């Protein structure tokens, strides 16, 4: 075992030296010249009410008008963000739900939590009711994230340190992604739906290949858990948020760490991150009741989105029109 | 809402809100409890006395026309610091300890200490259950000692306020005072501990009722600055 450990150490060394050699100049030196964005003012335009307990997740639709939200009282609600109307109200079998997703075609929704099961709900039925169509079981830990690829393939993240790719038609895993040490907290798909990144409590992020089902790269630099991960609009970068009140920006081709967004007035960890349509603004939610908006190229604080409790989820519309946030006081606010 | 279809949509939304009101009224009149324990503790038999890799279990019981919901965690990993944040709003926590082993007691103490000082678990009062008293009673008179594990047992005597052999009572109150020593070290008067001496009973539900009653009363008194 000692020899194996020695080999691992030499292999690790043969990677840090290469990345340090390729490190070269940093983002700050090159991005200093560009005029700053200035200041950003955003005002609340809607307030969606009706959730009893606190909110953990929400997800926009592709039509840029509908959205779905999940709450601890055992309820899924689909809203109409323009007229503030309610379209559907779905009761769940279990009340400890942690995530929700909305299909790209708008035909299905999914949810899961402290029951090790991911459920699929069919919205367009001959009868005028929403009924469950498939229960996906096989995980050991709690479900922390789930995302659709199309109407038949879904990618789930669990607390048993593994990710999985499913087949909703048959309900059996077709691929398993092992390699993480701690429980996995979030995942983010790619625009071409060929790769996806992941974050876990072992303070590392990995990049996977869906087709062949094996890890390709590993990223480190954080000191504590990973709570949220987003992925650059271009497809060659991504950002993470941790429990040490810091956010990073990692490259794929360079395989290193770019500029870091941190400030001395934040002690609490980040719960969610998301980008803008052009990737110019990175905005993240915190535990100190607030939400901050950063400049993605200069790490300057530009704007504050000031909720009465912890902020748990974010979201940016596909055409970049609006931003939605959830919180533990059971209110959804839409900014613009 | 200038079109007919818009009016029908608004009416549908109003019906949904009425159903949500009904659900809210049902929800506000119920109390949730979280049950914790280990493999040696009889927390699996306490549930049955009150009464497929699932991740959580549920049990419902009623006393004096009040409904209680008690949730027992099922098949999970050994790490707890992540899914413990979903229970920061329960009425109380029921903690079960097996004080008849003399060996894993320090573990139970460490577990209790970690739960008590959690940032998200503040303002939650813990109800302590000391289970399997018959085993301890049978294991104390026969004479496996406590001096080797806890060196301070030699300088401990039964307090005058104890309400009871005398060695059995001294050992019980030593364990109880160790737990209470842990509990009272901090908390700044926002959550409390209610220890008990439980056996392998038809009164645990009543004890939970009374403890929850006292917890809610203290919270309401503190809210109005009457305490």
């Amino acid at each position, epitope marked *: 075992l000692d020899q194996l450990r020695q080999e691992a150490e030499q292999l690790k060394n043969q990677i840090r030296d290469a990345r340090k050699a390729c490190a070269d100049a940093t983002l700050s030196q090159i991005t200093n010249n560009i005029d700053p964005v200035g200041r950003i003012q955003m005002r609340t335009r809607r307030t969606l009410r009706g959730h009893l307990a606190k909110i953990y997740a929400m997800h926009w639709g592709t039509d840029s008008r509908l959205l779905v939200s999940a709450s601890q009282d055992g309820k899924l609600i689909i809203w109409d963000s323009y007229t503030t109307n309610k*379209v559907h109200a779905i009761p769940l079998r279990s009340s400890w739900v942690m995530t929700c997703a909305y299909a790209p075609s708008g035909n299905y929704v999914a949810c899961g939590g402290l029951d090790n099961i991911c459920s699929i709900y069919n919205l367009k039925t001959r009868e005028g009711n929403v009924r469950v169509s498939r229960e996906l079981a096989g995980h050991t830990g709690y479900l922390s994230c789930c995302r659709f690829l199309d109407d038949n393939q879904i990618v789930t993240s669990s607390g048993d340190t593994t990710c999985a790719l499913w087949d909703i038609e048959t309900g059996q895993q077709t691929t398993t992604f092992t390699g993480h040490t701690g429980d996995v907290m979030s995942l983010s798909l790619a625009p071409d739906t060929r790769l996806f990144v992941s974050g876990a409590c072992d303070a590392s992020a990995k990049l996977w290949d869906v087709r062949e089902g094996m890890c390709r790269q590993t990223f480190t630099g954080h000191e504590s858990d990973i709570n949220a991960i987003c992925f650059f609009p271009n497809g060659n970068a991504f950002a993470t948020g941790s429990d040490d009140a810091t956010c990073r920006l990692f490259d794929l081709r360079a395989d290193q760490e770019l500029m870091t967004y941190s400030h001395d007035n934040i002690i609490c960890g980040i719960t969610s991150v998301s980008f803008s349509k052009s990737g110019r603004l990175l905005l993240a939610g915190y535990d100190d009741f607030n939400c901050n908006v950063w400049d993605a190229l200069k790490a300057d604080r530009a704007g504050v989105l000031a909720h009465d409790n912890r902020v748990s989820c974010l979201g940016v519309t596909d055409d970049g029109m609006a931003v939605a946030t959830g919180s533990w006081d059971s209110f959804l606010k839409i900014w613009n | 809402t200038l079109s007919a279809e818009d009016k029908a949509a608004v009416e*549908r939304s109003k019906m949904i809100e009425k159903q949500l009101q009904k659900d809210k009224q049902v929800y506000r009149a119920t109390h949730r409890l979280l049950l914790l324990g280990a493999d040696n503790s009889g927390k699996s038999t306490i549930v049955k006395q009150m009464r497929k890799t699932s991740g959580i279990f549920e049990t419902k019981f009623q006393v004096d026309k009040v409904n209680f919901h008690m949730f027992d965690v099922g098949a999970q990993r050994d790490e707890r610091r992540k899914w413990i944040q979903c229970f920061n709003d329960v009425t109380a926590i029921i903690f079960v300890v097996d004080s008849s082993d003399y060996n894993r007691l320090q573990e139970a103490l460490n577990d209790f200490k970690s739960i008590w000082n959690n940032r998200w678990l503040r303002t939650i009062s813990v109800i302590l259950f000391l289970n399997k008293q018959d085993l301890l009673a049978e294991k104390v008179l026969a004479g496996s000692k406590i001096e080797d594990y806890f060196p301070e047992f030699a300088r401990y005597t039964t307090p005058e306020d104890a309400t009871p052999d005398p060695r059995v009572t001294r050992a019980k109150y030593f364990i109880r005072d160790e737990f209470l020593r842990i509990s009272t070290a901090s908390g700044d008067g926002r959550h409390y501990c209610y220890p008990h001496f439980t056996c392998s009973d038809t009164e645990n539900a009543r004890r939970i009722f009374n403890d929850c009653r006292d917890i809610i009363q203290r919270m309401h008194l503190r809210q109005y600055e009457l305490l």
Partner: single-chain antibody
Amino acid sequence: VQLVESGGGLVQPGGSRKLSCSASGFAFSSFGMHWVRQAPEKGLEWVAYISSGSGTIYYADTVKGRFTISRDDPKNTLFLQMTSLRSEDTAMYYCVRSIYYYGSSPFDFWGQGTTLTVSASADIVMTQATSSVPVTPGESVSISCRSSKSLLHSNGNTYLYWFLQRPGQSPQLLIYRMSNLASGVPDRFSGSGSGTAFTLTISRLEAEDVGVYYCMQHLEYPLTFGAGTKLE
């Protein structure tokens, strides 16, 4: 999803008849309900409307104090109460579902109907250009509809519907809101318009496309149905 109507028969003038529509196979208490009339040799006509929560009720201007609608959700039944029957209400009555939310498709299912023989203004008027056109099984067909008021709304919707009943069956639904295609209809139908003049096109053609095509407008609550365009 299936609806059955019972009652009918021959009623002397001045009498009363009570029609019942029985639904089974879907979540009945979530749909609005309508009654639609069809004269023996004429087009369709709208009669009444009751909503899902029974909070809103409308009637046609022709019959407002004579007819009465009611529903019972426990038993999934819809009723029509008629009193003082005149000699004009001698047609066949249909039972129609409808559900309204963002993206729904109203008027999607129709009943089978029952017959009723009686012995002896400011609303939008909808007109169709022609009455009968002969074609060949494989050629292209275009049908025109015209409206006296702009069916385009401020929000951005254009409320127009096409039904095209088969000669012997109840009407079905082809297009809703001028562009959107129904679920089970073949994807060779299309619709377009400008707000006042409207057209429906059928690229290919088979033996099942024969029948009478109708025009309906949902902009206002009073409903006026298209005259008809038979295909031979």
